[PDB]
Amino acid sequence: GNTTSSVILTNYMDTQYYGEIGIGTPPQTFKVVFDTGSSNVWVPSSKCSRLYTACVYHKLFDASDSSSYKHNGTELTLRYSTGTVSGFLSQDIITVGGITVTQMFGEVTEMPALPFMLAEFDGVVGMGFIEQAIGRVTPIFDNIISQGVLKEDVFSFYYNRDSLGGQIVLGGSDPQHYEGNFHYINLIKTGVWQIQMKGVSVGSSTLLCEDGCLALVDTGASYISGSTSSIEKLMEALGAKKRLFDYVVKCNEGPTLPDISFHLGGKEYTLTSADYVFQESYSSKKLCTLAIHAMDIPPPTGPTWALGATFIRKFYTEFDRRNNRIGFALARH
Ligand SMILES: O=C(C1=C(c2ccc(CCCOc3cc(F)ccc3Br)cc2)CCNC1)N(Cc1ccccc1Cl)C1CC1
Numbered sequence: 567g568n569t570t571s572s573v574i575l576t577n578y579m580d581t582q583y584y585g586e587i588g589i590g591t592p593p594q595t596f597k598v599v600f601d602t603g604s605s606n607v608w609v610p611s612s613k614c615s616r617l618y619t620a621c622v623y624h625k626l627f628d629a630s631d632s633s634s635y636k637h638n639g640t641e642l643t644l645r646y647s648t649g650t651v652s653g654f655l656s657q658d659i660i661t662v663g664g665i666t667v668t669q670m671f672g673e674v675t676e677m678p679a680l681p682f683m684l685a686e687f688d689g690v691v692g693m694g695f696i697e698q699a700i701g702r703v704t705p706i707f708d709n710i711i712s713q714g715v716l717k718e719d720v721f722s723f724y725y726n727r728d729s730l731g732g733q734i735v736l737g738g739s740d741p742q743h744y745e746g747n748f749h750y751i752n753l754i755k756t757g758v759w760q761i762q763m764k765g766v767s768v769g770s771s772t773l774l775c776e777d778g779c780l781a782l783v784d785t786g787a788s789y790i791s792g793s794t795s796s797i798e799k800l801m802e803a804l805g806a807k808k809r810l811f812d813y814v815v816k817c818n819e820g821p822t823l824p825d826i827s828f829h830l831g832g833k834e835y836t837l838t839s840a841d842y843v844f845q846e847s848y849s850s851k852k853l854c855t856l857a858i859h860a861m862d863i864p865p866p867t868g869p870t871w872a873l874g875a876t877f878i879r880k881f882y883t884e885f886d887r888r889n890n891r892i893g894f895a896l897a898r899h
């Protein structure tokens with residue numbers, strides 16, 4: 567085939583990037599994060615009690631309004647950090663840009679109020695592999711590959727600062743949003759969008775990951791994350807102060823913070839202070855949050871760093887299923 571499909575994304579506060587899909591006949595539309603760090607499609611169910619704040623303010627999929635729905639009903643569960651997300655399996659037609667695919671997805675009937683009530687999007691489209699799919703449910707991109715319509719079996723992400731919030735392209739990349747050529751790194755193994763990282767540097771010197779470490783390239787994560795211990799070290803080197811849920815610096819010190827570099831494949835990928843400090847002020851009397859957090863990701867996938875939107879904003883990213891690799895290029899804004 568010779569198809570590419572693009573979907574325009576909205577940038578909410580540099581932490582959530584989401585675009586529209588349609589499910590059912592007629593289509594019920596949902597704003598969703600396209601997430602390389604998971605493998606299932608989830609939308610809230612019309613069966614979610616209105617006594618869940620995580621459902622009350624989002625769009626709900628109603629199977630009773632869709633002529634193309636096919637019942638399944640298998641329970642599926644995710645033991646998330648703040649509580650259980652559970653729902654049940656359903657099948658319907660899903661449109662993503664130009665593409666229409668028959669897809670099995672989860673209808674959520676309960677999920678914790680935090681963090682999900684603070685999502686400006688309604689659902690999640692996992693762009694990961696079947697190896698990590700709850701219930702081994704065939705992921706959406708697997709089903710699109712099977713249609714044999716895509717120009718290439720890749721998909722690409724542009725995240726803007728904050729005007730276009732971002733863009734996902736299915737079947738290729740959009741050269742309007744990057745400069746030069748991609749540089750590629752092979753997946754450690756098929757099944758996870760995760761690559762080797764060869765070190766993390768502050769200024770000119772390698773501080774961390776000296777012996778090597780893992781990097782999950784996670785389009786659904788807001789931040790760059792590392793293990794509690796790695797991040798403690800990094801923040802020490804930055805002179806950043808720990809809070810209960812983030813790290814901060816005195817706002818005036820923000821622009822003088824050193825570059826942080828991630829050695830991936832044959833290249834160093836450098837973020838300057840402007841790429842990782844939320845410069846909400848320049849005052850010595852105010853504290854500024856960093857777009858780098860600690861997260862201890864458990865096995866099998868962790869422990870690992872995760873390169874989320876903080877990283878992807880700077881580096882346009884292509885996820886290549888044909889060749890089991892990830893490519894980066896400098897984004898154009
Ligand atoms: O944290 C994540 C990430 C992952 C994830 C977390 C939870 C799930 C369970 C399904 C959650 O389903 C929903 C979540 C909503 F916010 C609103 C409606 C629904 Br339905 C699936 C994936 C997997 C790994 N990659 C990031 N979020 C939540 C999130 C991310 C970024 C900002 C806010 C929030 Cl709540 C998913 C990707 C969007």
Ligand SMILES: *[C@H]1O[C@H](CO)[C@@H](O)[C@H](O)[C@H]1NC(C)=O
Nearest residue numbers: 638639640655670701702703
């Ligand atoms: C939902 O139901 C079955 C359980 O019997 C499950 O194996 C499968 O993934 C779903 N059905 C189809 C048709 O794929």
